[model samples]
Target: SNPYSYAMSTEEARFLTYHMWPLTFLSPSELARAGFYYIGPGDRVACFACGGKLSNWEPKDDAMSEHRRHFPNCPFLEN
Candidate 1:
Protein backbone atom coordinates (compact mmCIF):
# COMPACT_ATOMS: atom_id res chain seq x y z
CA SER A 1 0.00 0.00 0.00
CA ASN A 2 2.38 2.69 -1.17
CA PRO A 3 0.48 5.93 -1.17
CA TYR A 4 3.56 7.83 -2.24
CA SER A 5 3.88 6.25 -5.64
CA TYR A 6 3.16 8.83 -8.32
CA ALA A 7 4.80 10.55 -11.27
CA MET A 8 6.00 14.13 -11.05
CA SER A 9 5.85 16.49 -14.00
CA THR A 10 8.92 18.15 -15.52
CA GLU A 11 7.84 21.48 -14.09
CA GLU A 12 7.49 19.96 -10.66
CA ALA A 13 10.99 18.52 -10.85
CA ARG A 14 12.40 21.89 -11.83
CA PHE A 15 10.51 23.64 -9.05
CA LEU A 16 11.96 21.33 -6.47
CA THR A 17 15.51 22.39 -7.27
CA TYR A 18 14.75 26.08 -7.35
CA HIS A 19 13.59 28.59 -4.77
CA MET A 20 10.05 28.73 -3.43
CA TRP A 21 9.79 32.04 -1.62
CA PRO A 22 6.07 31.91 -1.01
CA LEU A 23 6.51 29.08 1.43
CA THR A 24 8.80 31.16 3.60
CA PHE A 25 7.25 29.70 6.71
CA LEU A 26 8.83 26.41 5.65
CA SER A 27 12.52 26.99 5.25
CA PRO A 28 14.51 24.96 2.74
CA SER A 29 16.63 23.63 5.56
CA GLU A 30 13.57 22.56 7.48
CA LEU A 31 12.21 20.73 4.45
CA ALA A 32 15.58 19.15 3.71
CA ARG A 33 15.72 17.87 7.26
CA ALA A 34 12.48 16.01 6.62
CA GLY A 35 13.61 14.94 3.12
CA PHE A 36 11.13 17.19 1.24
CA TYR A 37 11.34 19.43 -1.80
CA TYR A 38 8.56 21.81 -2.80
CA ILE A 39 6.44 21.49 -5.92
CA GLY A 40 4.56 24.71 -6.55
CA PRO A 41 1.50 24.07 -8.68
CA GLY A 42 -0.34 22.36 -5.85
CA ASP A 43 1.75 23.62 -2.97
CA ARG A 44 2.78 20.01 -2.58
CA VAL A 45 6.07 18.66 -1.29
CA ALA A 46 7.82 15.39 -2.02
CA CYS A 47 10.14 13.38 0.20
CA PHE A 48 13.65 13.01 -1.14
CA ALA A 49 14.12 9.48 0.07
CA CYS A 50 10.68 7.97 -0.17
CA GLY A 51 8.81 10.11 -2.71
CA GLY A 52 5.96 10.68 -0.26
CA LYS A 53 3.86 13.80 -0.77
CA LEU A 54 2.00 16.26 1.46
CA SER A 55 0.35 19.66 1.14
CA ASN A 56 -1.82 22.27 2.84
CA TRP A 57 0.85 23.89 4.93
CA GLU A 58 0.10 25.80 8.09
CA PRO A 59 2.27 28.45 9.69
CA LYS A 60 3.00 26.21 12.66
CA ASP A 61 3.57 23.11 10.55
CA ASP A 62 6.74 21.11 11.03
CA ALA A 63 8.00 19.03 8.10
CA MET A 64 8.85 15.98 10.12
CA SER A 65 5.49 15.99 11.85
CA GLU A 66 3.60 16.27 8.59
CA HIS A 67 5.76 13.67 6.90
CA ARG A 68 5.06 11.16 9.61
CA ARG A 69 1.36 11.98 9.66
CA HIS A 70 0.86 11.48 5.94
CA PHE A 71 3.34 8.73 5.21
CA PRO A 72 3.69 6.75 8.38
CA ASN A 73 5.48 3.86 6.70
CA CYS A 74 8.01 5.95 4.81
CA PRO A 75 11.49 4.54 5.20
CA PHE A 76 12.92 8.00 5.76
CA LEU A 77 10.75 8.56 8.83
CA GLU A 78 12.63 8.35 12.13
CA ASN A 79 11.87 5.57 14.52
Candidate 2:
Protein backbone atom coordinates (compact mmCIF):
# COMPACT_ATOMS: atom_id res chain seq x y z
CA SER A 1 0.00 0.00 0.00
CA ASN A 2 1.08 3.58 -0.47
CA PRO A 3 2.69 4.78 2.74
CA TYR A 4 0.33 7.77 2.92
CA SER A 5 -2.78 5.72 2.41
CA TYR A 6 -4.59 6.41 5.64
CA ALA A 7 -1.65 5.24 7.66
CA MET A 8 -1.77 8.16 10.08
CA SER A 9 -3.79 7.93 13.22
CA THR A 10 -6.69 10.37 13.65
CA GLU A 11 -4.77 12.56 16.04
CA GLU A 12 -1.78 12.76 13.77
CA ALA A 13 -3.89 13.57 10.77
CA ARG A 14 -5.75 16.19 12.75
CA PHE A 15 -2.55 17.84 13.84
CA LEU A 16 -1.24 17.94 10.29
CA THR A 17 -4.44 19.36 8.92
CA TYR A 18 -4.54 21.97 11.62
CA HIS A 19 -1.04 23.12 10.94
CA MET A 20 -1.59 23.01 7.21
CA TRP A 21 -3.57 26.27 7.43
CA PRO A 22 -0.88 28.24 9.20
CA LEU A 23 1.74 26.80 6.93
CA THR A 24 -0.21 27.97 3.94
CA PHE A 25 -0.22 31.58 5.08
CA LEU A 26 3.39 31.69 6.19
CA SER A 27 5.69 34.26 4.60
CA PRO A 28 9.04 33.19 3.20
CA SER A 29 10.94 34.02 6.35
CA GLU A 30 8.12 32.77 8.50
CA LEU A 31 8.11 29.52 6.57
CA ALA A 32 11.82 29.17 7.02
CA ARG A 33 11.51 29.96 10.67
CA ALA A 34 8.76 27.41 10.96
CA GLY A 35 10.96 24.91 9.09
CA PHE A 36 9.87 25.45 5.46
CA TYR A 37 7.65 22.42 5.30
CA TYR A 38 5.84 22.39 2.00
CA ILE A 39 4.05 19.32 0.71
CA GLY A 40 5.96 16.99 -1.56
CA PRO A 41 6.80 13.81 -3.41
CA GLY A 42 4.83 10.76 -2.29
CA ASP A 43 1.15 11.60 -1.93
CA ARG A 44 1.78 15.34 -1.63
CA VAL A 45 -0.30 15.12 1.47
CA ALA A 46 2.27 15.76 4.15
CA CYS A 47 4.84 18.42 5.07
CA PHE A 48 8.36 18.21 3.68
CA ALA A 49 9.83 17.78 7.13
CA CYS A 50 7.38 15.01 7.83
CA GLY A 51 8.56 12.98 4.85
CA GLY A 52 6.57 14.84 2.21
CA LYS A 53 8.55 15.87 -0.85
CA LEU A 54 8.80 19.58 -1.64
CA SER A 55 8.45 19.13 -5.36
CA ASN A 56 7.24 16.63 -7.96
CA TRP A 57 4.52 15.29 -5.75
CA GLU A 58 1.47 14.30 -7.73
CA PRO A 59 -1.88 13.32 -6.30
CA LYS A 60 -3.57 10.36 -7.92
CA ASP A 61 -7.35 10.01 -8.09
CA ASP A 62 -7.52 8.00 -4.93
CA ALA A 63 -5.33 10.50 -3.16
CA MET A 64 -7.64 13.30 -4.22
CA SER A 65 -10.65 11.33 -3.12
CA GLU A 66 -9.14 10.66 0.23
CA HIS A 67 -8.26 14.31 0.75
CA ARG A 68 -11.71 15.43 -0.22
CA ARG A 69 -13.36 12.91 2.02
CA HIS A 70 -11.17 13.30 5.05
CA PHE A 71 -10.28 16.94 4.86
CA PRO A 72 -12.97 18.55 2.79
CA ASN A 73 -11.75 22.03 3.58
CA CYS A 74 -8.10 21.14 3.37
CA PRO A 75 -5.52 23.83 2.82
CA PHE A 76 -2.76 21.48 1.73
CA LEU A 77 -4.79 20.30 -1.23
CA GLU A 78 -4.30 23.71 -2.84
CA ASN A 79 -0.81 23.02 -4.08
Candidate 3:
Protein backbone atom coordinates (compact mmCIF):
# COMPACT_ATOMS: atom_id res chain seq x y z
CA SER A 1 0.00 0.00 0.00
CA ASN A 2 2.98 2.32 -0.30
CA PRO A 3 2.53 5.21 -2.66
CA TYR A 4 6.24 5.77 -3.11
CA SER A 5 7.14 2.32 -4.31
CA TYR A 6 7.66 3.52 -7.86
CA ALA A 7 10.53 1.81 -9.58
CA MET A 8 13.79 3.68 -10.06
CA SER A 9 15.80 3.68 -13.28
CA THR A 10 18.90 1.50 -13.45
CA GLU A 11 21.16 4.54 -13.52
CA GLU A 12 19.44 6.01 -10.53
CA ALA A 13 19.79 2.79 -8.60
CA ARG A 14 23.42 2.47 -9.47
CA PHE A 15 24.35 6.04 -8.60
CA LEU A 16 22.58 6.09 -5.30
CA THR A 17 23.76 2.64 -4.38
CA TYR A 18 27.40 3.35 -5.03
CA HIS A 19 27.79 7.01 -4.05
CA MET A 20 25.38 7.70 -1.24
CA TRP A 21 26.38 7.22 2.33
CA PRO A 22 23.73 5.50 4.39
CA LEU A 23 22.65 7.71 7.23
CA THR A 24 22.88 5.85 10.46
CA PHE A 25 19.90 7.59 11.99
CA LEU A 26 17.72 8.07 8.94
CA SER A 27 16.26 5.33 6.82
CA PRO A 28 15.33 5.43 3.15
CA SER A 29 11.70 4.95 4.19
CA GLU A 30 11.92 8.08 6.29
CA LEU A 31 13.31 10.07 3.37
CA ALA A 32 10.47 8.73 1.25
CA ARG A 33 8.05 10.15 3.78
CA ALA A 34 9.38 13.58 2.85
CA GLY A 35 9.18 12.77 -0.86
CA PHE A 36 12.96 12.51 -1.26
CA TYR A 37 15.16 10.12 -3.20
CA TYR A 38 18.92 10.28 -3.27
CA ILE A 39 20.42 11.61 -6.49
CA GLY A 40 24.05 10.86 -5.48
CA PRO A 41 25.76 13.24 -7.87
CA GLY A 42 26.49 15.66 -5.04
CA ASP A 43 24.85 14.12 -2.05
CA ARG A 44 21.68 15.74 -3.22
CA VAL A 45 18.13 14.70 -2.50
CA ALA A 46 15.37 15.17 -5.02
CA CYS A 47 11.71 15.43 -4.34
CA PHE A 48 10.02 12.84 -6.49
CA ALA A 49 6.70 14.63 -6.36
CA CYS A 50 8.05 18.00 -7.49
CA GLY A 51 11.45 17.27 -9.00
CA GLY A 52 13.09 19.80 -6.71
CA LYS A 53 16.68 19.08 -5.82
CA LEU A 54 18.62 20.05 -2.69
CA SER A 55 22.23 19.55 -1.72
CA ASN A 56 24.74 20.43 1.04
CA TRP A 57 23.17 18.09 3.52
CA GLU A 58 24.10 17.72 7.15
CA PRO A 59 23.38 14.77 9.34
CA LYS A 60 20.92 16.80 11.35
CA ASP A 61 19.11 18.21 8.34
CA ASP A 62 15.45 17.37 8.00
CA ALA A 63 14.28 16.55 4.52
CA MET A 64 10.92 18.26 4.88
CA SER A 65 12.55 21.49 5.94
CA GLU A 66 14.96 21.43 3.05
CA HIS A 67 12.18 20.66 0.62
CA ARG A 68 10.11 23.57 1.82
CA ARG A 69 13.07 25.92 1.84
CA HIS A 70 13.95 25.16 -1.75
CA PHE A 71 10.54 24.42 -3.20
CA PRO A 72 8.03 26.45 -1.31
CA ASN A 73 5.25 25.97 -3.84
CA CYS A 74 5.71 22.27 -4.35
CA PRO A 75 2.38 20.54 -3.89
CA PHE A 76 3.91 17.58 -2.13
CA LEU A 77 5.42 19.68 0.64
CA GLU A 78 3.34 19.36 3.78
CA ASN A 79 2.34 22.60 5.46
Top candidate by TM-score: 1
Model 2 C-alpha lDDT per residue in residues 1-79, reported as the tens digit of each score:
4333343323344234333233232232332232223343322334322333332323332334444454554444453
Q: What is the full ranking by lDDT, best candidate first?
A: 1, 3, 2
Q: Is candidate 2 or candidate 3 better by TM-score?
A: 3
Q: What lDDT is reached at residue 28 by model 1? A: 64
Q: In candidate 3, what are the lDDT values of residues 1-79, reduced to their tens digit?
A: 5333245323354235423455565555556667777776656666655677776677787877777878898766653
The full ranking of all candidates by TM-score, starting with the best, is 1, 3, 2
- Candidate 1 residues 1-79, lDDT tens each? 4444333223344335546456767776677667676765656777755677777789999888888888888776753
TM-score of each: 0.67, 0.23, 0.60
How far residue 18's Cα lies from its native spot in candidate 3, in Å, is 9.0
How high is the CA lDDT of each candidate model?
Answer: 0.67, 0.35, 0.62
Candidate 1 local distance difference test against the native: 0.67
The 10 consecutive residues of candidate 3 with the worst lDDT sum are 2-11
In Å, residue 36's CA in model 3 sits off its true spot by 0.9
Q: Residue 9 deviation, candidate 3, in Å?
A: 13
Candidate 3 structure, TM-score to reference: 0.60
